[PDB]
Amino acid sequence: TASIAQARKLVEQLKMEANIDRIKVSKAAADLMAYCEAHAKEDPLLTPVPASENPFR
Template sequence: MKDGIANNSTASISQARKAVEQLKMEACMDRIKVSKAAADLMAYCDAHIREDPLIMPVPASENPFREKKFFCTIL
């Protein structure tokens, strides 16, 4: 019975140490406000809009995935 309690206690201590290490790492991170991060993201998107194929479609002549049109030659 004591072995089970000791193992459980050891696991609990191990989990607590991992949590403390994670919290220490997070405390050292530089943080910025969400409004600044959003503004930076919008500026990045605006600066790279020409390279985004979802906004500026790839010309059909350069698109390797375009549908190929086949015509019926039997008729």
């Protein structure tokens, strides 16, 4: 039937999901904040750009 087929596909997907290796959330947060601070200068949204070279003035 279709029920057994969808069940076996689902269990295969979950067992393929469970074999991956995770990374500590603290390290992920550190990497994310490092990326945020590294490109902080090159963001006109966070730091408004002077109107002399703002094309939308």
